Design a protein around this ligand. Structure first.
Ligand SMILES: Cc1cn([C@H]2C[C@H](O)[C@@H](COP(=O)(O)OP(=O)(O)O[C@@H]3C[C@](C)(N)C(=O)[C@@H](C)O3)O2)c(=O)[nH]c1=O
Ligand SMILES: Cc1cn([C@H]2C[C@H](O)[C@@H](COP(=O)(O)OP(=O)(O)O[C@@H]3C[C@](C)(N)C(=O)[C@@H](C)O3)O2)c(=O)[nH]c1=O
Ligand SMILES: Nc1ncnc2c1ncn2[C@@H]1O[C@H](CSCC[C@H](N)C(=O)O)[C@@H](O)[C@H]1O
Ligand SMILES: Nc1ncnc2c1ncn2[C@@H]1O[C@H](CSCC[C@H](N)C(=O)O)[C@@H](O)[C@H]1O
Ligand SMILES: [Cl-]
Ligand SMILES: [Mg+2]
Ligand SMILES: [Mg+2]
Ligand SMILES: [Zn+2]
Ligand SMILES: [Zn+2]
Lengths: 405, 402
């Protein structure tokens, strides 16, 4: 059976999402025959507790020059990261020439604020097209993967870092031991690694299975991160819940013994215990709920198609690949998906090949129903689409359950 | 005989913050108003409330120096509120939102831009003209039974009545909720967000207690006030703004099913013991502790010869300075970005208010952070101060130097 990527012990599988494409490999017609697939399934290490995918997707297939996710296409997320820059600038710098490092800086949504404040900084972004965005904003960015050797080389040329930050990146990286070897080389004396990622507790509580796909190798919790930190000579010393991306936790890891864990760490552990997050049974109940959501969503879409309604998807999310492929949802059930990201438009969604169109197509004419794939952005979207609702249009949500609004 | 402004039963006092000035009344350099600031808990309905009501025309007036749109974080916060209300509550052919206390109208402007019918109530003439300037329909009236009833009659039913940092400012809740009964749709709701009692107690954030904050709402006291007025607490949400708030959703009794969040927050109040006067006494004890340590610290520092400056001329700061006895001998002046407040003096204790630039002229040894709710923003801005060896004094949730 599978072996844990953190500790090497045995992983018990609890959800099999079947054959899946790369979530962010939007296709032209020419690409469909060559299309990569893998088996997506999730399990729990019985030793260390880390919840993780069973099949590692090679990193160069996911992250590469044409990687299509631009972080700065959301107002809520631009403002989130401006506040992140402030937090780090306020609490994690010392001395005359402090140094902020980000792993997975993308289009520079966070570091651009660090730069504008005059603080020395460096991002690692192996996806060149978004890295060019970051650079166009004044950000220093190496087009390379953060791992032990690259971090260690930066330590020599740039000196110690006050903080290494990563958002929606650390869970994308199976090779955590290399990353933390790199952090141990690169951080200064009072340095920390601060990372925020989709939280297992929220996923389980919301039945948000679409948070499970190729780029989410780990579904972190405080318990698993605490064990992982200790294994690599680090220590979980602070936790913070965040509402973005469906529910996340931001973890702060110091070298072991360097800092006093905050009371927040124990509080979140107790939440996990109240949730039963570390019982496989809870995880099995999750998997049954995932199956109910699939049946109810497919039955709803099938009925709306039978009635001759028009259904269109809203937001070509990476997440949505898990939904379409696990649920068997093709162009017969959802005619196209509207998305604001220019590089996603005029292409086909992974595996199930829904056409992606610009947002403007949503109004020409308005559909009867919009399937909200970008449900983590619901208020922004439902707010602005007033003409849709005035014409009687309805929203279909499937988190935390299938429902029509 | 302290009487509950919601149910009229007896209020038991648990904290006395002494003689205080009006919080937002900054002085040019004799006729200075003081009132007694103290807080108690109605033993019958649980509502925590000030023991003396400041007459409202003294507080809310033409030159009121808070514009909501002044802060980036509240601009951002209110954009999201607009999106929330528009997404969740303002459904139908021709939905109508009313706001109590719309101020300079940032929130309603997004409702106006979405093409939704609305009306702000804003009795401060000046902020009201700003809101109008942004396209917001505003009456320059206090929201109360009569004014709300007439809006019902010209404009028809409202889907939502919303209030931010305003409901806690209004003693006359019965009048407000009558207004809302006249004016709300069938499935309409009153949605309001205010500084949360549970956070105040948890953070010993006693500077949240001052003239404008007449009520310190909890889920429990809100549920009881709602039921008194024939409404029902059907939703709650915690918000990090202004030191910790909760947003309460009220519908008419039986109109909606309370969300699971209402019960969870009531549980957290059970766990915190928030409905026990003993817990409030403990809080009052901690406030006294905070004063001792802060005073003792500032005194040590100025004997040691160090220079101290305040950062942010907040409304809240007046409670701290006057309760703690903090005058210009302990803390030399206060920097602030509100032109409105600059080159005037602080209420009661009289620290002078000078613009942000004065902080760097030269930097002090210690900066006493009154605008503690904006710590990241402020501390991230002030890189040279830190680089120069500066230090920050905070007193929430406890006195300490970072
Ligand atoms: C607000 C808005 C968005 N949209 C569109 C824009 C995006 O294409 C998509 C949203 O993608 P959004 O939920 O942010 O991330 P995705 O699930 O892809 O997830 C990606 C991939 C990644 C790194 N692995 C990850 O973990 C999260 C961080 O990011 O929706 C509109 O059309 N109209 C809109 O008004
Ligand atoms: C960010 C920043 C602020 N500053 C300054 C700006 C303000 O004067 C003060 C902040 O006041 P701020 O915490 O918002 O509210 P106050 O307690 O006044 O409270 C007021 C009174 C009122 C309506 N009753 C209320 O409840 C809240 C909503 O608003 O500090 C800087 O100098 N530099 C900065 O970088
Ligand atoms: N080993 C590694 N080092 C640095 N970046 C990496 C990486 N592996 C993947 N990435 C980058 O991680 C990013 C995840 S996208 C998330 C971007 C941004 N921090 C946000 O929160 O929105 C991608 O741009 C991808 O190229
Ligand atoms: N009965 C009443 N009706 C409407 N507005 C009122 C009121 N009593 C006070 N106000 C106004 O309520 C506001 C409180 S200040 C808060 C303003 C804004 N809602 C915000 O959250 O930033 C002031 O503008 C004050 O003039
Ligand atoms: Cl399964
Ligand atoms: Mg230790
Ligand atoms: Mg539009
Ligand atoms: Zn393991
Ligand atoms: Zn009472």
């Amino acid at each position: 059976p599978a072996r844990c990527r953190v500790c090497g012990d045995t992983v018990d599988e609890f959800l099999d999402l079947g054959r899946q494409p790369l979530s962010d490999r939007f296709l032209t017609p020419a690409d469909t025959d060559g299309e990569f697939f893998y088996r997506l399934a999730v399990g729990r290490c019985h030793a260390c507790g880390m919840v993780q995918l069973t099949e590692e997707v090679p990193r160069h297939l996911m992250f590469h020059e044409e990687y299509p996710y631009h972080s700065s296409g959301s107002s809520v997320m631009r403002e989130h990261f401006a506040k992140v820059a402030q937090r780090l600038l306020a609490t994690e710098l010392t001395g005359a020439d402090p140094f902020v490092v980000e792993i997975g800086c993308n289009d520079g949504i966070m570091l651009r604020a660090v730069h504008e404040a005059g603080v020395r900084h460096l991002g690692f972004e192996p996806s060149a097209g978004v890295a060019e965005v970051a650079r166009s904003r004044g950000v220093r960015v190496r087009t390379e993967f953060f791992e032990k050797a690259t971090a260690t080389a930066v330590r020599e040329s740039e000196g110690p870092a006050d903080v290494i930050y990563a958002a929606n990146t650390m869970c994308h990286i199976p090779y955590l031991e290399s990353v933390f070897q790199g952090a141990d080389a690169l951080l200064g004396p009072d340095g920390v690694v601060v990372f925020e990622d989709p939280y297992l507790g929220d996923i389980v509580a919301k039945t948000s299975f679409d948070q499970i796909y190729d780029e989410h190798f780990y579904l972190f919790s405080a318990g698993s991160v605490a064990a992982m930190a200790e294994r690599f000579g680090f220590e979980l010393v602070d936790v913070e819940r965040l509402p973005v991306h469906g529910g996340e936790v931001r973890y702060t890891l110091a070298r072991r013994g360097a800092r006093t864990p905050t009371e927040a760490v124990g509080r979140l552990l107790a939440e996990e215990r109240e949730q039963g997050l570390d019982d496989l049974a809870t995880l099995r109940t999750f998997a049954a709920n995932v199956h109910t959501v699939r049946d109810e969503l497919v039955a709803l879409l099938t009925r709306l198609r039978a009635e001759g309604h028009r259904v269109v998807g809203y937001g070509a999310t990476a997440k949505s690949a898990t939904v379409t492929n696990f649920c068997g949802i093709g162009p017969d059930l959802v005619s196209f998906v509207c998305d604001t990201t220019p590089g996603k438009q005029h292409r086909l969604t992974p595996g199930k090949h829904l056409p992606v169109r610009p947002a403007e197509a949503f109004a020409d004419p308005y559909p009867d129903y919009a399937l909200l794939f970008a449900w983590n952005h619901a208020d922004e979207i439902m707010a602005k689409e007033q003409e849709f609702r005035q014409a009687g249009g309805r929203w279909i949500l499937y988190v935390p359950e299938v429902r029509v609004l």
